[PDB]
Design a protein around this ligand. Structure first.
Ligand code: HEM
Ligand code: HEM
Ligand code: HEM
Ligand code: HEM
Ligand SMILES: O=C1NC(=O)c2c(NCc3cc(Br)ccc3O)cccc21
Ligand SMILES: O=C1NC(=O)c2c(NCc3cc(Br)ccc3O)cccc21
Ligand SMILES: O=C1NC(=O)c2c(NCc3cc(Br)ccc3O)cccc21
Ligand SMILES: O=C1NC(=O)c2c(NCc3cc(Br)ccc3O)cccc21
Ligand SMILES: O=C1NC(=O)c2c(NCc3cc(Br)ccc3O)cccc21
Ligand SMILES: O=C1NC(=O)c2c(NCc3cc(Br)ccc3O)cccc21
Ligand SMILES: [K+]
Ligand SMILES: [K+]
Ligand code: NA
Ligand code: NA
Ligand code: NA
Ligand code: NA
Ligand code: NA
Ligand code: NA
Ligand code: NA
Ligand code: NA
Ligand code: NA
Ligand code: NA
Ligand code: NA
Ligand code: NA
Ligand code: NA
Lengths: 156, 156, 156, 156, 156, 156, 156
C-alpha cells in the first residue's frame, strides 16, 4: 500500500533511533555483566530486546507502505563509562527518541495515517516507561547512595 | 434497627478518619512506587486497602442503624515530602484515629451497643498493628541509617 | 519526566471526578445492599472499584509527570433517596465526567502528550460503558415497571 | 452438474428470504441487547446465525448446480419498534419464507431434484421451529403480561 | 447517549461498506470452494467473518448513540470471474473502505467522539491487514506463477 | 585479564562482520515475509538471530580481555532486490566473514590465545553451515526452477 | 598408548597446579564459612570441586599415556588473611596456571598430541572463567566498598 513519503521518512528516523538504542543498551548490558552488576545487566538486556521488537515493527510497517527500511546509517552511540553515566546516556537517548516520536505522530495525523500513528503511540508508551525506569534509578542513586545502589544490583 | 444518635455520630467520625487514611496512604504508596521504593509502596498500598475495608464496615453498620454515612466531608491529609516525614505523618494520623476509636468505644459501651463496640475494637486492633509497624520503621531508620533503610525497601 | 502544567491540571480535574464517583457509587452500593437489592449493590460496588482503578492510573501518571496529585479536594456527592434517583445521580455525574474527559483529551493532543491522551481515552471508554448501563437501567424501569425492576435486582 | 433453471430461481428466492432474515434478526438482537433485554438478544442472535447457515447451504447448492447465487438483491427488512412488533415482524417474515419453501419443494419434486428438495425440507423444518418459538412468545406476552414477559428476558 | 448526527452518518457509511464486504467475501469463498481451491475458500471465509464482527460493533455503537443502523441499503458487490479478479475486486473494495474510514475518523476527531474514533481505528487496522494479504497474494501470483499459486491453494 | 591488542582488533573485525550480517539478514527476512515467502522469512530470521548470538559472545570476550567492543562502525549492507540476489548477497558476506575468521584464528594461535581461537572456531563452524545452506538454496533454484523454489517457501 | 615424555611432564605440572588450587580453594571456602561469609564459602567450595574434576581428567590422561601421575609433590599454597587477599591469592595462582597451560598446549601441538591439547584447552577455558570471576569480585570491592561487599556474601 503506497504510503506518504514523509511518513516513511519519519518511520525511518524512528527506526534509526531504535537501532542506536539496541546497540547502546546491548553494550551497557554486557558492560554491567562484566562488572558483576548482573541485575543491571539483565534489565538492560531486556531493554535492548524491547528496542529490537520496536525496530522489527517499524521495518515491517515501512515495507508494507512500499518504502525502503534504512538499517545502514547508524547514528552516534552514547556509551557511558560508569553506572550513573550509562543511565544518563540512556535517558538522553530516550528523550531524543520521544521528541522524534511526537513529531512523527503529528505528521501521521495530518496525512491521516492513523495506523502508523497507533504504532508510534505504542512505541512512545514503551519509551516513556523506559524514561520512568531511568529517572527512578538515577533518583535511587541519590537516595540510597551509589555504593548501596550498586550493591543492590549485583545479584539478579 | 434504629441506632443511638451519638453512636452514629461517633461512627461517622471514625469513618471520616478512615477516609483521610485511605487517601493519605494511597498517595504515599504511589509516591514510594514512583521513587522506586517498591517495598514501602506495596506495604503502604496494603495499609490503604485495610482502611478501605474498615470504612466499608463502618458504612454498612451506620446504614443498618438507620443513619446517613458521611462520605462528603474529607479532613486534612498529612502528606510528607520524604520517607521519614511520610512515616511520621502516617503515625500522627493513626494516633489521632486511636484516640477517636477509644472515645467511640466508651460511648457504645454506655448505650449498650455492644456490636458496634466489637467492630470498633477490631478496627482498633488493626490501627495498633499499623502503629507498631510505623514506630518500628522509624526506629529502624535510626538503627541501620536512612540510606540502608531505603535500600532495603527498593525491591519487593 | 516534566509534564505540561495544564495537562497535570486536567489530570487532577479528572481525578477529582473519579474521587467523587468512588464515594458516590460505594455509598449507593451499600444502600442498595442494606435495602435487600443485592444485585444492584454488587453491580454498583464493581462500578466503584472500576473508578478506584482509574484514579490509581491517574495518580501514577501525575507523579510520573512530576505533578502533585490532589486527593484533598472532594466535590459534591450526588446521593439519591430511591433507586430511580440514585441511577439518575450516577448518570448526571458520568455526563459531567465525560465532558471533562473530552476537554482533557483535546488539550493532551494540542501539547502532543499522546500517552496521557491514550490513558484518558481508555477511561472515557469505561465511562461510556457505565453511561450505557445507567441509561439502560432507567429504560428498563419504564418497560418492566419499577416493582418488577426492583424484584429482578433483589438476588445477586 | 447443470441444474434446472427454475430450481435455481427458486433457490435464489429462498436465499433472498434468508438474507433479509439474517439482517432483520441481527438488528433485532442488537436492539434488544441495547435495551437490556439480553435473553431476547441472545436468542435472536442465534436465530440470525441459523439463517446464515441456511444461506451458506443454499449458496453452495446453487454453485454446484452451476447457477449464480444472488447476494445483491436485498428485499425489505421488517423492523419493529418494540418487542411485540419485533416478534410479529419476525413471524410475518417466517410465514412468507415457509410459503416460498413449499412452492420450491413442489417444483423440485416435479423435476426430480430430490437432493434440492431434501435441503429445502431441512430448512423448512428449522423455519417451522422458529415459528413455534415466535408464536409461543406472543402467546406468553398475553398470558403473563408484557411487563412480566420483558422482566423474564432481561438476564440470560 | 445522543451522538453527533454526522458521526452516525459516517458510521452507517462504514457499516454499508462492511455489509458489501461480508457478502462479496462470502460468495468469493464459496466460489473458491466449489472450484476446489479450498485454502483460498477457507481464508476468504475468515475474511467474511471478520467483516461480520466489524459490522456487529458498528451496529452496537450506532444504537448506543441513539441512531438507526442501516442494514437495508446494500451497495454494489464486486464479484470476479477468476481468482486474480476476485482478489483485485476485494482489494478495490478495501481501498474504498479505508478511504471512508479515514474521512470518518477526521470527523470523529473534530467533534471529540474519541470512542467512535478508536473503534474506527481498530477496524482500519484490520482492513490494512486485509490489504496487505491481498497485495501479497497478487504479488505471489507473479512470483510463483498462476498455476503454482492455484496449486498451493487447493488443499487446506 | 588484559588481552593481546591485535587479538582484540581481530575480534572487533569479526564483530563488525556479524553486525553487518545481523541487519542484512533481518532486512532480507522481513522482505521475504512482506512478499509472502514466509518459510524463507522464518529461516532468514533464524540466521539473523544466530549472528546476534555470535555478536554477543564476541562482545563478552572483548570485554573480558579489557578491550572496547566496536558497535559504532557499521560496514556496507548487501541488500538484494530479488530472492536469488538476496541469497548471493548473504553468501558473499559469509565468504568475507570466513576469510576474516581464518586470519584471526592464525593470530590467536601465534600469541597462544587458545580460548579466543576456540570461540572463533565455533563461529566458523556456524558460518560454514550457513554457507552450505546458501549454496544449497542457489543450487535448488537451478534444479527445480525459481517459481517452484518460491512456491515451496510460501508457507512455514 | 605410550605418550610423549615431555607431554607427560607438562601434564604432571598442570596436575601439580590443580592440586595446589584444590587445597587452597577448599581452605579459603572453609575460612569464609567460619567467618559467616557463606556465599563466598559456597562459591569457593564449587571452585575447589571444579579443580578436583580437572585433576581427575589429568590423572586419567597421564595413566592412559603410560606415565605416573604425581600426587606426591604439593607446591606452595597461597592462603590469604582477609577476603581481599584470599581472592588475590586465588587470582595469582590462576594466572600462573594459565601460563603453564599455554606452554603445555604449545608442546602438545608440536608433537601432534591433539587430544591432550583439547583437554588442556577445556581446562584453560575453565580457568579463564575463574579469573573472570575473581577480577570481577576484586572490582566489586572497589565499587560497592568492602563492608557492602562482605555484607552481600553473608547469606547464600
Ligand atoms: C548489536 C546488535 C544486536 C545484538 C547484539 C542482538 C542480540 C540479540 C539476542 C542475544 C537475542 C536473543 C536470542 C536468543 O537467545 O533467543 C536477540 C533477539 C532478537 N533480536 Fe536482536 N540483537 C541485535 C540486533 C537486532 C536488530 C538490529 C534487530 C531488528 C532489526 C533485532 C531483532 C531481534 C528480535 C525480533 C529478537 C527476538 C526477541 C524475542 O522475541 O525474544 N536484533 N537479539
Ligand atoms: C470511600 C472510599 C473507599 C472505599 C470505601 C473503598 C473500598 C474498597 C474495597 C472494599 C476494596 C476491595 C478490597 C478487597 O478486595 O478485599 C477496594 C479496592 C481497591 N481500592 Fe478502594 N475504596 C475507597 C477509595 C479508594 C481510593 C480513593 C482509591 C484510589 C486509588 C482506591 C483504590 C483501590 C484499588 C486500586 C483497589 C484494588 C481493586 C482491584 O484491583 O481489585 N480506593 N476499595
Ligand atoms: C448483517 C450481516 C451479518 C452480520 C452482522 C453477521 C454476524 C455474524 C457474527 C457476529 C458471527 C459470529 C462470528 C464469531 O464467530 O464470533 C457470524 C457467523 C457466521 N456468519 Fe454471519 N453475519 C452477517 C451476514 C452473513 C451472511 C450474509 C452469511 C452467508 C451469506 C453469513 C454466514 C455466517 C456463518 C456461516 C457463520 C458461522 C456460523 C457457525 O458458527 O457455524 N453471515 N455472523
Ligand atoms: C583437602 C583435600 C580435599 C578435600 C577437603 C575434598 C573434599 C571433597 C568433598 C567434600 C567432595 C564432595 C563430597 C560429597 O558430598 O559427595 C569432593 C568431591 C570430589 N573430589 Fe575432593 N577433596 C579433596 C581433594 C581431592 C583431590 C586431591 C582429588 C583428585 C585428585 C579430588 C577429587 C574429587 C572428585 C572427583 C569429587 C567428585 C565431585 C563430583 O563431581 O560430584 N578431591 N571432594
Ligand atoms: O456522604 C453522604 N452520605 C449521605 O447519606 C449523603 C446524602 N444523603 C441524601 C439523603 C438520602 C436519604 Br435515603 C435520606 C436523606 C438524605 O439527605 C447527600 C449528600 C452526601 C451524603
Ligand atoms: O492531595 C494532596 N496531594 C499532594 O501532593 C498533597 C500535599 N503535598 C505535600 C508535598 C509533597 C511534596 Br514531595 C512536595 C510538595 C508538597 O506540597 C499536601 C496536602 C495534600 C496533598
Ligand atoms: O450477487 C451476486 N451473485 C453473483 O454471482 C454475482 C455476480 N456474478 C459475477 C459473475 C461471475 C461469473 Br464466474 C460469471 C458471470 C458473472 O456475472 C456479479 C454481481 C453480483 C452477484
Ligand atoms: O436497516 C434498517 N435499520 C433500521 O433501524 C430500520 C428500520 N427501523 C424501524 C424503526 C425502529 C425504531 Br426503535 C425507531 C424508528 C424506526 O424507523 C426500518 C427498516 C429498515 C431499517
Ligand atoms: O561502539 C562502541 N563501543 C564502545 O565501547 C564505545 C564507546 N565507549 C566509551 C569508552 C571510551 C574509551 Br577511550 C574507554 C572506555 C570507554 O568505555 C563509546 C562510543 C561507541 C562505542
Ligand atoms: O604421586 C605418585 N604417583 C605415583 O604413581 C607414585 C608412586 N608409584 C610407584 C610406581 C607404580 C608403578 Br604401577 C610403576 C612405577 C612406580 O614407580 C609412588 C609414590 C608416589 C607416587
Ligand atoms: K548496605
Ligand atoms: K413479576
Ligand atoms: Na520516577
Ligand atoms: Na532495581
Ligand atoms: Na521492611
Ligand atoms: Na436493612
Ligand atoms: Na441502552
Ligand atoms: Na440487571
Ligand atoms: Na424465554
Ligand atoms: Na465444482
Ligand atoms: Na505485502
Ligand atoms: Na497462502
Ligand atoms: Na527449504
Ligand atoms: Na570482569
Ligand atoms: Na556475589
Amino acid at each position: 500500500m503506497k504510503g506518504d513519503k514523509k511518513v516513511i521518512q519519519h518511520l525511518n528516523k524512528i527506526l534509526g533511533n531504535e537501532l542506536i538504542a539496541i546497540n547502546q543498551y546491548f553494550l551497557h548490558s554486557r558492560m554491567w555483566n562484566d562488572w558483576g552488576l548482573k541485575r543491571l545487566g539483565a534489565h538492560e538486556y531486556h531493554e535492548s530486546i524491547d528496542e529490537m521488537k520496536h525496530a522489527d515493527k517499524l521495518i515491517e510497517r515501512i515495507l508494507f507502505l512500499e518504502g525502503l527500511p534504512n538499517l545502514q546509517d547508524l547514528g552516534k552511540l552514547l556509551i557511558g563509562e560508569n553506572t550513573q553515566e550509562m543511565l544518563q546516556c540512556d535517558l538522553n537517548l530516550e528523550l531524543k527518541a520521544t521528541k522524534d516520536l511526537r513529531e512523527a505522530i503529528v505528521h501521521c495525523e495530518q496525512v491521516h495515517d492513523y495506523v502508523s500513528r497507533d504504532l508510534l503511540k505504542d512505541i512512545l508508551e514503551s519509551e516513556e516507561e523506559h524514561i520512568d525506569y531511568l529517572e527512578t534509578q538515577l533518583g535511587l542513586i541519590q537516595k540510597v547512595g551509589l555504593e548501596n545502589y550498586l550493591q543492590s544490583h549485583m545479584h539478579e
